[PDB]
Amino acid sequence: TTSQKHRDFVAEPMGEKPVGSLAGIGEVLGKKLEERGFDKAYVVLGQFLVLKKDEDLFREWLKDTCGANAKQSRDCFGCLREWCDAFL
Amino acid sequence: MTTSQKHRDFVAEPMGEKPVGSLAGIGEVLGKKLEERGFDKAYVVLGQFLVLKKDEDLFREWLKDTCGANAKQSRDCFGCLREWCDAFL
Numbered sequence: 028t029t030s031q032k033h034r035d036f037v038a039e040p041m042g043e044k045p046v047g048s049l050a051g052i053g054e055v056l057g058k059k060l061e062e063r064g065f066d067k068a069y070v071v072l073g074q075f076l077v078l079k080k081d082e083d084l085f086r087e088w089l090k091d092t093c094g095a096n097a098k099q100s101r102d103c104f105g106c107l108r109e110w111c112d113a114f115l
Numbered sequence: 116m117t118t119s120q121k122h123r124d125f126v127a128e129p130m131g132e133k134p135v136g137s138l139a140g141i142g143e144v145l146g147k148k149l150e151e152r153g154f155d156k157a158y159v160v161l162g163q164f165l166v167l168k169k170d171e172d173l174f175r176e177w178l179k180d181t182c183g184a185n186a187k188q189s190r191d192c193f194g195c196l197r198e199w200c201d202a203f204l
Contacts, residue, residue, distance in 0.1 A: 064168075070165060072165055073162045073164070073165025077159060079153075114204075115130065115131065
Protein backbone atom coordinates (compact mmCIF):
# COMPACT_ATOMS: atom_id res chain seq x y z
CA THR A 28 0.00 0.00 0.00
CA THR A 29 0.98 3.64 -0.48
CA SER A 30 0.72 6.95 1.31
CA GLN A 31 -0.80 10.05 -0.27
CA LYS A 32 2.70 11.56 -0.02
CA HIS A 33 3.88 8.79 -2.35
CA ARG A 34 1.00 9.24 -4.78
CA ASP A 35 1.49 13.02 -4.86
CA PHE A 36 5.20 12.58 -5.67
CA VAL A 37 4.76 10.00 -8.42
CA ALA A 38 2.01 12.01 -10.15
CA GLU A 39 4.12 14.86 -11.49
CA PRO A 40 7.62 16.04 -12.43
CA MET A 41 9.59 16.68 -9.25
CA GLY A 42 11.31 19.87 -10.44
CA GLU A 43 12.93 21.60 -7.47
CA LYS A 44 10.88 19.85 -4.78
CA PRO A 45 12.75 19.59 -1.46
CA VAL A 46 14.06 16.24 -0.33
CA GLY A 47 11.22 16.08 2.20
CA SER A 48 8.65 15.56 -0.57
CA LEU A 49 9.93 11.99 -0.96
CA ALA A 50 7.81 9.30 0.67
CA GLY A 51 9.56 8.17 3.84
CA ILE A 52 11.69 11.31 4.24
CA GLY A 53 10.40 13.17 7.28
CA GLU A 54 11.78 16.18 9.08
CA VAL A 55 14.60 14.28 10.78
CA LEU A 56 15.77 12.34 7.71
CA GLY A 57 15.42 15.44 5.54
CA LYS A 58 17.66 17.53 7.80
CA LYS A 59 20.40 14.89 7.77
CA LEU A 60 20.15 14.61 3.99
CA GLU A 61 20.37 18.39 3.53
CA GLU A 62 23.44 18.51 5.79
CA ARG A 63 25.15 16.00 3.48
CA GLY A 64 24.33 17.89 0.27
CA PHE A 65 21.04 16.21 -0.71
CA ASP A 66 18.82 19.26 -0.39
CA LYS A 67 16.45 18.52 -3.31
CA ALA A 68 14.52 15.39 -4.27
CA TYR A 69 16.32 15.26 -7.62
CA VAL A 70 19.71 14.86 -5.88
CA VAL A 71 18.43 11.67 -4.24
CA LEU A 72 17.00 10.60 -7.62
CA GLY A 73 20.54 11.13 -8.91
CA GLN A 74 21.94 8.64 -6.40
CA PHE A 75 19.15 6.18 -7.23
CA LEU A 76 20.15 6.43 -10.91
CA VAL A 77 23.94 6.23 -10.33
CA LEU A 78 23.22 3.02 -8.43
CA LYS A 79 21.31 1.71 -11.47
CA LYS A 80 18.02 1.62 -9.53
CA ASP A 81 19.34 -1.24 -7.39
CA GLU A 82 16.97 -1.60 -4.46
CA ASP A 83 19.34 -3.21 -1.97
CA LEU A 84 22.20 -0.79 -2.66
CA PHE A 85 20.00 2.32 -2.69
CA ARG A 86 18.20 1.44 0.55
CA GLU A 87 21.55 0.65 2.21
CA TRP A 88 23.03 3.93 0.97
CA LEU A 89 20.05 5.79 2.43
CA LYS A 90 20.42 4.08 5.82
CA ASP A 91 24.15 4.85 5.85
CA THR A 92 23.60 8.47 4.83
CA CYS A 93 20.68 9.67 6.96
CA GLY A 94 19.69 6.75 9.22
CA ALA A 95 16.51 5.71 7.43
CA ASN A 96 14.94 2.57 8.88
CA ALA A 97 13.59 -0.21 6.69
CA LYS A 98 10.11 1.29 6.28
CA GLN A 99 11.42 4.76 5.48
CA SER A 100 13.93 3.42 2.96
CA ARG A 101 11.32 1.11 1.44
CA ASP A 102 8.96 4.07 1.03
CA CYS A 103 11.63 6.32 -0.47
CA PHE A 104 12.84 3.63 -2.89
CA GLY A 105 9.32 2.82 -4.08
CA CYS A 106 8.40 6.44 -4.78
CA LEU A 107 11.56 7.00 -6.82
CA ARG A 108 11.05 3.72 -8.71
CA GLU A 109 7.44 4.59 -9.61
CA TRP A 110 8.41 8.16 -10.49
CA CYS A 111 11.03 6.86 -12.92
CA ASP A 112 8.57 4.40 -14.49
CA ALA A 113 6.29 7.38 -15.23
CA PHE A 114 8.73 10.10 -16.26
CA LEU A 115 12.25 8.91 -17.04
CA MET B 116 18.93 25.95 -33.95
CA THR B 117 22.68 25.43 -33.42
CA THR B 118 22.39 22.21 -31.42
CA SER B 119 23.11 18.91 -33.07
CA GLN B 120 20.24 16.81 -34.35
CA LYS B 121 21.52 14.31 -31.79
CA HIS B 122 20.89 16.80 -28.99
CA ARG B 123 17.48 17.57 -30.44
CA ASP B 124 16.51 13.89 -30.60
CA PHE B 125 17.59 13.32 -27.02
CA VAL B 126 15.82 16.31 -25.50
CA ALA B 127 12.58 15.67 -27.38
CA GLU B 128 11.46 12.69 -25.29
CA PRO B 129 12.00 10.74 -22.05
CA MET B 130 15.26 8.81 -22.26
CA GLY B 131 14.09 5.47 -20.87
CA GLU B 132 16.75 2.84 -21.38
CA LYS B 133 18.63 4.69 -24.12
CA PRO B 134 22.35 3.82 -24.21
CA VAL B 135 24.95 6.34 -23.17
CA GLY B 136 25.84 7.01 -26.82
CA SER B 137 22.45 8.66 -27.35
CA LEU B 138 23.80 11.67 -25.45
CA ALA B 139 25.12 14.61 -27.42
CA GLY B 140 28.90 14.72 -27.34
CA ILE B 141 29.21 11.02 -26.55
CA GLY B 142 30.52 9.22 -29.61
CA GLU B 143 31.60 5.61 -29.78
CA VAL B 144 35.03 6.22 -28.24
CA LEU B 145 33.70 8.07 -25.20
CA GLY B 146 30.71 5.74 -24.95
CA LYS B 147 32.92 2.68 -24.64
CA LYS B 148 35.00 4.27 -21.87
CA LEU B 149 31.85 5.29 -20.01
CA GLU B 150 30.42 1.78 -20.34
CA GLU B 151 33.66 0.28 -18.97
CA ARG B 152 33.31 2.45 -15.86
CA GLY B 153 29.71 1.29 -15.30
CA PHE B 154 27.97 4.23 -17.01
CA ASP B 155 26.17 2.13 -19.59
CA LYS B 156 22.80 3.84 -19.95
CA ALA B 157 22.18 7.53 -20.45
CA TYR B 158 20.19 7.65 -17.20
CA VAL B 159 23.29 6.66 -15.22
CA VAL B 160 25.06 9.76 -16.56
CA LEU B 161 21.91 11.74 -15.78
CA GLY B 162 22.33 10.37 -12.26
CA GLN B 163 25.83 11.80 -11.96
CA PHE B 164 24.64 15.13 -13.39
CA LEU B 165 21.96 15.30 -10.68
CA VAL B 166 24.20 14.13 -7.84
CA LEU B 167 26.47 17.06 -8.78
CA LYS B 168 23.43 19.38 -8.51
CA LYS B 169 23.64 20.12 -12.25
CA ASP B 170 26.89 22.06 -11.76
CA GLU B 171 28.55 22.61 -15.14
CA ASP B 172 32.11 22.78 -13.83
CA LEU B 173 31.88 19.65 -11.68
CA PHE B 174 29.99 17.64 -14.28
CA ARG B 175 32.27 18.57 -17.18
CA GLU B 176 35.39 17.86 -15.09
CA TRP B 177 33.91 14.51 -14.06
CA LEU B 178 33.29 13.60 -17.71
CA LYS B 179 36.86 14.56 -18.64
CA ASP B 180 38.31 12.48 -15.79
CA THR B 181 36.05 9.50 -16.50
CA CYS B 182 36.21 9.15 -20.29
CA GLY B 183 38.65 11.80 -21.56
CA ALA B 184 36.01 14.09 -23.06
CA ASN B 185 37.31 17.32 -24.58
CA ALA B 186 35.74 20.74 -24.04
CA LYS B 187 33.23 20.51 -26.89
CA GLN B 188 32.16 16.95 -26.04
CA SER B 189 31.66 17.80 -22.38
CA ARG B 190 29.78 21.01 -23.21
CA ASP B 191 27.46 19.17 -25.59
CA CYS B 192 26.77 16.38 -23.11
CA PHE B 193 26.10 18.84 -20.28
CA GLY B 194 23.81 21.00 -22.44
CA CYS B 195 21.84 17.94 -23.57
CA LEU B 196 21.26 16.78 -20.00
CA ARG B 197 20.46 20.32 -18.85
CA GLU B 198 17.81 20.80 -21.52
CA TRP B 199 16.41 17.30 -20.95
CA CYS B 200 15.95 18.13 -17.28
CA ASP B 201 14.31 21.46 -18.08
CA ALA B 202 11.80 19.56 -20.25
CA PHE B 203 11.09 16.47 -18.14
CA LEU B 204 12.43 16.59 -14.55
